[PDB]
Each structure stands twice: as structure tokens, then as C-alpha cells.
Design a protein around this ligand. Sequence first.
Ligand SMILES: NC(=O)C1=CN([C@@H]2O[C@H](COP(=O)(O)OP(=O)(O)OC[C@H]3O[C@@H](n4cnc5c(N)ncnc54)[C@H](O)[C@@H]3O)[C@@H](O)[C@H]2O)C=CC1
Ligand SMILES: Cc1cc2nc3c(=O)[nH]c(=O)nc-3n(C[C@H](O)[C@H](O)[C@H](O)COP(=O)(O)O)c2cc1C
Ligand code: SF4
Ligand code: FES
Lengths: 213, 85, 430
Amino acid sequence: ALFVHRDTPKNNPETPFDFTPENYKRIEAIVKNYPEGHKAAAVLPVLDLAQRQNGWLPISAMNKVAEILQVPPMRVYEVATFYTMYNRKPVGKYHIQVCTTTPCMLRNSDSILEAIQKKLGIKVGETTPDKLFTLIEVECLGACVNAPMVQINDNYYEDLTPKDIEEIIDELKAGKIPKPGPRSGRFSCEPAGGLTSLTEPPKGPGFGVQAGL
Amino acid sequence: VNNTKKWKMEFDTRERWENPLMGWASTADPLSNLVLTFSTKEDAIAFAEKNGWSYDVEERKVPKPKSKSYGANFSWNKRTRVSTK
Amino acid sequence: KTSFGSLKDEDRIFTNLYGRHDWRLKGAQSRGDWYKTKEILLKGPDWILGEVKTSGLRGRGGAGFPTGLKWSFMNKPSDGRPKYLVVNADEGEPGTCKDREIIRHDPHKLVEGCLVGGRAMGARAAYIYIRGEFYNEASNLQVAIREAYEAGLIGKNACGSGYDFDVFVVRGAGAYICGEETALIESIEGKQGKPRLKPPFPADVGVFGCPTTVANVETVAVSPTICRRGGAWFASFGRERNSGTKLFNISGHVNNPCTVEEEMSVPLKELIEKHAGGVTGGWDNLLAVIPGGSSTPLIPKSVCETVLMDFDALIQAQTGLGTAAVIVMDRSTDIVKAIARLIEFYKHESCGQCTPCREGVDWMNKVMARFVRGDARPAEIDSLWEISKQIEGHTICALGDGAAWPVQGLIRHFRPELEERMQRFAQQHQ
Ligand SMILES: NC(=O)C1=CN([C@@H]2O[C@H](COP(=O)(O)OP(=O)(O)OC[C@H]3O[C@@H](n4cnc5c(N)ncnc54)[C@H](O)[C@@H]3O)[C@@H](O)[C@H]2O)C=CC1
Ligand SMILES: Cc1cc2nc3c(=O)[nH]c(=O)nc-3n(C[C@H](O)[C@H](O)[C@H](O)COP(=O)(O)O)c2cc1C
Ligand code: SF4
Ligand code: FES
């Protein structure tokens, strides 16, 4: 929760970090998306790439991103502390993010936060001792009609009950991967008691196209 | 900048020494605290010449007009891009 | 036309909103996407801007600026710099989950919107700034962009029209402020997502210092349907200056929380009772509705009975249309706790750049955290009102406005509930 860095033996500028060569090819593809003379625009993806290789960002991933993009290291530190996805501390293998803003709080996200807490034996911000789960509490994840929902590392788990999130944590501990979707009967975002719209077949190419075109 | 509006006349600083009893700053200069305020340079010059004071005049140093553009922080091809904000 | 709503399925722009059809290129072309795109591109920028101006399309991001007038700010000869369309796909607004559905289920509609809009504004390329939390949606959009490049629909000689146009996807990294257009531009440029002061508007100095239009996913993705069906078709829905269709996200205390496409000036009661299954406990169980996502002020049940869900009728209801994200709150809701959680959101999502938001949004969150418990006195209500008025209009971007407005709506419609909260705190703690 701090925004200064102190050198620890597991987080220092001599902590070993380097990209894999396939990650260097991915970095070249990232840098080619931006105009010549604006290589600094590749700070946010490549640093995120450094989080996808390592799981988190020690201050050698920040220094390596600053070195390969020829930007000052402070301008990478600003990005790494500004944005809430960059893990500047090592998180667990499954980073559970429970949304507790008002559309999820109205549909009882506190019960699911408590269910994760009493299932994993930890609280908000802590990590399980086997380094598998980090539970934090995030803002609106943009799945508001699928409230209450969580995010696990890339995946949204939606329309949750305490039983559903206990089942998801059970099959995360069992090595399997759960299905990223609503755990209720519906599929993505439709009304749960049947389609109130888009029941007709779509019309296809050419329908309603005006004259002179 | 409100303290840079008027002309001032001061005098050359004379000796300040240590009081033997208390360490206070003793002076023998009666004009050591005399600061006069004038609206223009010519009023100050006329007042100094009227009183027989030999004077030296420094001209008013105004800050020159700067060219400020907030859009220059985000140029396409110039060095005046800010690296942060 | 006087009554609005009951939109037919043949008039839906966002068919395959629900993922029930193939989102890929065969399914998109079988639903009407990428049809006669070359004939749209060869009619020039002025024809496309005329169709968007005639359609009455306003900014679906949430402010409702006229889209054709906005996009015509780029309709000017080049000065050596390239031009850029930038598609705002951040969608950080609580309540709002519609652009996720467009990216996830109709991605080629967004890509064709990028092509048509960038042809209208003379843009070289499209940068779709997607939210970093929408990882599966971003990879979904990248598969559709690969299908559009491999079909020759974008890229070198896009749709066989002789117009070159790339479509890039930049992922965010977890900042709600990076959906504000200049903060989004700063986030694309590899910096902290801090908003720029306006002027310069992005059509003068935008991304990389180039001319730039930042436009929402929804106002971009409806533009090929506007160019095909006609602007007079799109202006036939909703009231005047309130034209078209709109995606609505009804969440909170309804029976069936859902995203649905609906005609523009639909009643809020008709929308909730028709597509969302009504309020939990009936319509008489309704306490308040945040009409357009978290930045719009709440309206109580007496306003929600007759109000129309477009821009002008919600401005007359002293709230905003916003992102058209309907957050429904029933009688069992601690409404001070919900608005204070919303102000807690706005202090966790505040980039810290300017003084009134950086200091006053945290100070409003502290006052609201005391108002939940009642640990306050009633003279601090009007005080808080003034604090909101010292943030509104005094900040760099409208996140300060969007934090002041829920406080103002809560005070304006629920001052007696705040007062009875504080007096019961005072009588059971003194
Ligand atoms: N969609 C979402 O996820 C969210 C949407 N919003 C909405 O954002 C809105 C505020 O957004 P802003 O862009 O900060 O405010 P708005 O006043 O400025 O401007 C909207 C658009 O019009 C353009 N514009 C406005 N006046 C102009 C002028 N004189 N010359 C040239 N261009 C001009 C701006 O460049 C911008 O692209 C609110 O109404 C809120 O509901 C807020 C938060 C989240
Ligand atoms: C704090 C803040 C966050 C915003 N977030 C978004 C967003 O996530 N997505 C979006 O389309 N517009 C967002 N906007 C509105 C944009 O500034 C801008 O008006 C819009 O993205 C593009 O204009 P348009 O509505 O014509 O498409 C936000 C505005 C503010 C003040
Ligand atoms: S008002 Fe808040 S969100 Fe906007 S520039 Fe200022 S600190 Fe940033
Ligand atoms: S409120 Fe939880 S996802 Fe938007």
C-alpha cells in the first residue's frame, strides 16, 4: 500500500529479471504499434508484459522496461505506481479481485467477500500461506448486470452465490481451471427469465440499406 | 511581485560588530536602517541630489514577456514534450 | 411521434448483443456487417459526416456531444501530422457494462465503425484503448481484427477502396480516469493517466500531438449502420435532439439485471418493468434510481414514474442521461451507504492531478463515511453541499463533477434521512 520503494533482498535493482526471447519478439511487435519517436507509448504494455512473465514487478522489470524503451526510470515508476494492476509486491497464483462498488454491493457482494474470507482463511489484502490466492477488493470491473462478480487473473466469474465461488475456489485448488462466465442460468447479459429482445432472427446483409449506396 | 513596484533608496552598509556583553549587533551607522520609497527613479535622483548624497542608480529589471503554450507540452516533433505531468 | 420504446428487432443496431450468434467474420457478415463498406468509403468524408449529422447521433460516452459536429472538427487539410481516431473502450463507470458487450459480441461492428469513422475524419489509424480488465474482450477484438486484416477489410487498401487504415488495440492498466479522453490519450502515450487541460481539444493536439478524435465504442459501432440505413432512419427514433437507439444496463435491485438495446426516449418505468422484470418487490418497493451510471445524481421514485430516458428529460429531472446505466435501489437500501461507497470509488479513482478533486473528493468521502454512521451534525450537510460546489466546475476534467453530483443528488432528495440518521446517532451515543 506504499508508493515508495525500499530495497529488500527479494526486491532490489540486482533482482534477476530479463525477458525471454519470445517476449522480446512480443515487445518488438508492441513498439511497432506506435509512431517513430514515441517509443515511450510502449511503457504500459511492455511493463504489463513484464507482469505476465514474472507475476509481479520487482524493481528490475521497471528498470529493464526503462532500459529497452530508452525512457527514464522515474517515468516507468510513475506508471507502475499509478495503475492498480501492476503488482509491485508478489501476489499469489490466483489473484482474486472482488468488486464491491454500488451495483455489486446492492446485489450482495459482501456475502461473497465473506465466503472467500472464510473459505481461504485470509482477509482482504492478505495471501494464503501456500501462495495460491491473493484476495483484494477492487472497484467496478464493468460487469454490473452480472453482479455479484469476481475476477481471477484474466477471467470474470459472474452472477455468483457463496456456493458458486466456493466451487470455483475448490476447482482452483484442485489444479483445474473454471469456466469464466455467469454461474446462474444465463449465458452473458440477457434477462434471466428469457429474452425480452433479439428473439427474431437477424435480417442479414442489405436490409434497410438506403438508395444511392 | 508587489514588492517590486516602487523605487528605494538605501545606503552603503557600515560596520556591525559584536556587543561584548550580550553578543548583540552594535552599529555606529545612523543611516543603517534608512530606506526611502519613491514612485519614480527621477524623484529618488532629485531627492539624493537635493541632500548632497552621492548615488548610484540601477535600472528597473522587468521580466521579459514569455511565450506560454500549454499545447507545447504535447508536441508531435519538438523537444518541448513533457515526459510526465 | 409522442410515445417511445417498444423497439422492434429489425431496428436493432446491435444484433448479437447476447452472444447467441457467431461474433466472428462469417457471423458478422451474415448479420449485415461489412456490407457495401467500399461504397461508403468512396463517397468521401463529407457524405459520412453529413449522415452522422443528419442522424442526430450524440456522444454515447455519456456527455452527449453531437457526434457529426465533433467528427467534423477533423475535416480539415493535413499539416504534416497524421490523424487518429481513438476508440474509448475503457468503460469504468459503475453500472455500465455495454461496451464490453459490443467488444465481446459484435467486434467487427466496432472495427467497421473504426474504418468508417476514420475515413470520415481522415484518420490514419484507430487506437482502441480497451480496459485492461477486459482481457478476454481484448483478445476477442484482436481475433476479429486479424479476421478483418486477412479479409482485406482493413489495412493496406481497406475494403478495396484505396484508403489505408490500421486498427490498434491498446490495453489499459486499471484506472477509471483513463476513460476521460485526454487522460486516455496520456495513457496511450505511456504516461500516467492524467487529463490534459482543454484547450487544446484533441482535434488540434491529441494523441502523440496529432489531430485526434476520441469516441465511445457505441457511437463508433453504430456509424456503419447509420451510413447504410441512413441518417433519417436513425433520427426517426427518440425525441428531437435525442435521436436513435441506446444500450441500457439495468442493474442493482431488479429481478433480471440485463443489457438491452431500446429506443431513445423510452420511459424509465417501462424500461425497468419490460426488460428487467421490474423492481424487486414491485414498483412500490422502488426507493431511488441512478439513471445513467455513478456520475449522474439519483432520482427518487416520484421522479422515476414519468421520466424519459434521453438526455433532455433527465436534464429536466436535474440528473443526467450519462452512460444510460440504470442502477435500481429498492426500499431496503441504505442509500447513504451506497452513495458513500460511490464517493469511495471516486476517491480511489481520482488521478490526483488538480487540487479540488485530489483534496475535496477525499474530504467528501470522509464526510460521507461519517454520514453513514450519523457521526455528524446537520450543519455539515450544507457544508458538504458547498464542498461539492467547490469541486464542480473548478477541476481539470469532469471526474470532480462526477463526484460532486452524487453528493448533490443524495442531499437534494434525501436530506431528511441524513438528518434522522444523525439525530439517532446523537440520541444513542450521548
Ligand atoms: N462512458 C463512461 O464509462 C463514462 C462516461 N462519463 C460521462 O462523461 C461525461 C463527461 O465527459 P467529458 O468528455 O469530460 O465532458 P464533455 O463536456 O466535455 O465533452 C464530451 C466530448 O465533446 C468534446 N467537446 C466538448 N465541448 C467541445 C468544444 N467546445 N470544442 C470541441 N470539442 C468539444 C470533448 O472533446 C469530448 O470528446 C459525463 O456526462 C459522464 O456521464 C463519465 C464517466 C464514465
Ligand atoms: C472521469 C471520466 C471517465 C470517463 N470514462 C469514459 C469511458 O470509460 N468510456 C467512454 O466512452 N467515455 C468516458 N468518458 C467520457 C469521455 O471523456 C468522452 O466524452 C468520450 O469517451 C468520447 O466522447 P463521445 O461520447 O462522443 O464518444 C469519461 C469521462 C470522464 C470525465
Ligand atoms: S479532477 Fe480528479 S480526476 Fe481530473 S485531472 Fe483532477 S485529480 Fe484528475
Ligand atoms: S459494479 Fe461491480 S462490476 Fe460494475
